[PDB]
Amino acid sequence: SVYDAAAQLTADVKKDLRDSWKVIGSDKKGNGVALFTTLFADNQETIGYFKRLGDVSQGMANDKLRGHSITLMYALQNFIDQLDNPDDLVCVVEKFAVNHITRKISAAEFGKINGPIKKVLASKNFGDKYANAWAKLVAVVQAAL
Amino acid sequence: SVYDAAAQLTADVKKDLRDSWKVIGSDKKGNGVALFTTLFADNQETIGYFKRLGDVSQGMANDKLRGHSITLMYALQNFIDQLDNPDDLVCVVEKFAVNHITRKISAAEFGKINGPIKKVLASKNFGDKYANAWAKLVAVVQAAL
Numbered sequence: 001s002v003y004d005a006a007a008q009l010t011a012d013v014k015k016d017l018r019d020s021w022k023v024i025g026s027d028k029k030g031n032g033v034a035l036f037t038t039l040f041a042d043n044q045e046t047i048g049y050f051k052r053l054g055d056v057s058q059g060m061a062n063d064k065l066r067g068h069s070i071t072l073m074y075a076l077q078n079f080i081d082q083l084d085n086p087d088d089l090v091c092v093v094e095k096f097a098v099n100h101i102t103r104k105i106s107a108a109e110f111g112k113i114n115g116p117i118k119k120v121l122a123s124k125n126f127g128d129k130y131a132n133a134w135a136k137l138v139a140v141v142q143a144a145l
Numbered sequence: 146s147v148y149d150a151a152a153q154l155t156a157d158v159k160k161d162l163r164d165s166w167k168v169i170g171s172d173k174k175g176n177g178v179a180l181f182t183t184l185f186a187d188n189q190e191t192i193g194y195f196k197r198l199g200d201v202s203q204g205m206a207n208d209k210l211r212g213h214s215i216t217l218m219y220a221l222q223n224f225i226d227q228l229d230n231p232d233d234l235v236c237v238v239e240k241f242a243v244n245h246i247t248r249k250i251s252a253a254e255f256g257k258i259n260g261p262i263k264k265v266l267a268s269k270n271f272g273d274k275y276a277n278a279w280a281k282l283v284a285v286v287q288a289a290l
């Protein structure tokens with residue numbers, strides 16, 4: 001359950017999420033676009049869900065892709081800001097899941113974002129410890145799908 | 146059309162938006178719920194779009210309503226952060242409009258949020274000067290609906 005998954009966010013996991021977000025969230029446009037372009041590069045099968053975005057290979061030059069990428073980063077900002085209160089984190093995650101459930105995005109499908117997150121983290125000198133912390137946060141969302 | 150509306154965001158307007166957001170955005174849960182519940186209080190008919198939230202009369206205690214209210218504030222955070230780059234502001238506004246267009250929310254309907262914003266600003270001692278600046282930001286979104 002989402003309530004059980006949220007309880008897995010221990011003290012050090014929360015701390016590692018904040019420390020890495022301080023850097024990653026500093027450039028939402030740049031890191032947001034890097035995150036999603038990596039998703040399409042490593043998992044081309046997911047491109048089908050983004051027909052509305054057009055030619056995603058254009059990257060930053062694609063206004064729709066840039067708009068989506070910047071916006072995605074504010075969902076992550078929301079999650080990080082709610083780490084202090086489990087009740088608020090859960091209600092924001094459930095709210096976030098609504099549209100993804102309607103698009104038939106499964107937990108397994110959503111989990112494909114872990115790879116891209118690990119790579120972006122590594123590009124900023126944040127290793128496995130941080131990738132694992134982020135996988136824990138992603139797992140809270142997966143529990144809601 | 147959206148670019149034209151964005152042109153109304155003059156230097157002075159952006160300054161008032163940033164200055165008032167420094168306060169309003171410091172308590173996203175509190176002010177987001179105040180904003181949302183005021184919308185329902187002044188325009189009861191808007192509740193028709195929120196059947197999924199359940200018993201909205203519960204206010205803050207309603208987890209779904211609270212989740213939506215907090216999340217709403219990050220869309221505004223996004224807009225405020227993109228004020229200095231029209232190209233980015235426009236793409237984030239158009240991205241934001243997609244789901245609202247699908248919900249058949251007209252520009253006129255969306256404009257009903259102006260009253261609630263004026264009241265929330267006033268509760269923090271921000272006068273008409275600030276309410277007018279916010280109405281101009283809302284107008285950018287209206288141009289995309």
Ligand code: HEM
Nearest residue numbers: 046049050052068071072075076099100105109110113244
């Ligand atoms: C860290 C992970 C992710 C975050 C933070 C995220 C965030 C968002 C946000 C904020 C929106 C806009 C609001 C909405 O329409 O729900 C959105 C839209 C969307 N997301 Fe997610 N998402 C993530 C991963 C994914 C994945 C892995 C898929 C599918 C494989 C997915 C598919 C979609 C689609 C198709 C849209 C609509 C795009 C459009 O037409 O503009 N998302 N997502």
Ligand code: HEM
Nearest residue numbers: 099191194195197213216217220221244245250254255258
């Ligand atoms: C400045 C004001 C507003 C902001 C910043 C805002 C923001 C948001 C955000 C970020 C979402 C989640 C993503 C999505 O599904 O699109 C959302 C959902 C929604 N918004 Fe807007 N919105 C605003 C005003 C309105 C108004 C005036 C209406 C209708 C009278 C409206 C109706 C909806 C509905 C029905 C949902 C889905 C709620 C749910 O089932 O969870 N929004 N809005």
